[PDB]
Design a protein around this ligand. Structure first.
Ligand SMILES: NC(=O)[C@H]1CCCN(C(=O)Cc2cccc3occc23)C1
Ligand SMILES: [Zn+2]
Length: 139
């Protein structure tokens, strides 16, 4: 579990979105596993606007932060799940690192701010849904 809070927005994994998130929907994309909903309170996360390929993520299943090198956002095949059929997930970045299903929502950050959130994993890999292209999150 986990979310990004920036301005009047809440960014979460689309497969973990709540009834409240869907009742206050701003935008959602199944191909990215992202959903953004509106909030009454003000968010203070800084979103990174960069092409960094190194950063640090939070891994809830270990209660620890890990440094990682990660790939550029791209279309990566993801096996079928209870939430989606087998498909290519777009805007996804992979890294070598520990992850378990409950790790989704953990933030990945570089020196510039929030890069994205854990969205996939398995076999010593961890996948992050990128958020750096969503320029509208700031205004
Ligand atoms: N974006 C998707 O389509 C997700 C939906 C839920 C399932 N999923 C996973 O990758 C499950 C998983 C296994 C093992 C380590 C994992 O770390 C994070 C997630 C995960 C794909
Ligand atoms: Zn950066």
């Amino acid at each position: 579990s986990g979310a990004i809070y920036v301005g009047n927005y809440r960014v979460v994994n689309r497969h973990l979105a709540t009834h409240n998130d869907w009742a206050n929907l701003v935008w959602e994309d199944s191909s990215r596993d992202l959903l953004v909903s509106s909030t009454t309170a003000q968010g203070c996360d800084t979103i990174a606007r960069c092409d960094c390929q190194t950063g640090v993520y939070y891994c809830s299943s270990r209660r620890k932060h890990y440094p990682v090198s990660f790939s550029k956002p791209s279309l990566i095949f993801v096996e079928a799940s209870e939430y989606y059929p087998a498909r290519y997930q777009s805007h996804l970045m992979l890294a070598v690192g520990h992850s378990e299903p409950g790790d989704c929502g953990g933030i990945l950050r570089c020196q510039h701010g929030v890069v994205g959130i854990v969205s996939t994993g398995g076999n010593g890999l961890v996948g992050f849904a990128d958020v750096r292209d969503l320029l509208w999150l700031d205004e």
